[PDB]
Structures are given as structure tokens and as C-alpha cells.
Amino acid sequence: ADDDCLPRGSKCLGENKQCCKGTTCMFYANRCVGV
């Protein structure tokens, strides 16, 4: 649990972590993505 991030490649299905400022994580896509 932290305020880290996730580049365009790292999954995040169950991950409770949050991407960087301006980015968004997809549940079904299970992978961070920019706006």
C-alpha cells in the first residue's frame, strides 16, 4: 500500500495501489493507462 505508480505495461486487476498523477488503472484490462 503506497502512492506509487504503474507504467503502460504493469497490470493492476486486484492491486489496491494507485497509478501516477494523471494516469488511470483498468479493472478488466488489468493494466495502467494514461488519459
Cell, residue 25: 488503472
Phi, psi of 27 (to 5 degrees): -70, -60
Residue 18, by phi and psi: left (phi above 0), alpha (psi -120 to 50) or beta? beta
Place of cell 488503472: 25
CA distances from 28 to 19, 21, 31, 32, 35 (A): 16, 21, 8, 11, 17
| Cβ neighbours, 10 Å, residue 16 | 7
Answer for the pair 25, 6: CB distance below 8 angstroms, yes or no: yes
The single-letter DSSP state of residue 35 is -
Residue whose entry in the numeric block shows the C-alpha cell 486486484: 14
DSSP for 2-19, please give it.
-S----TT---SS-----
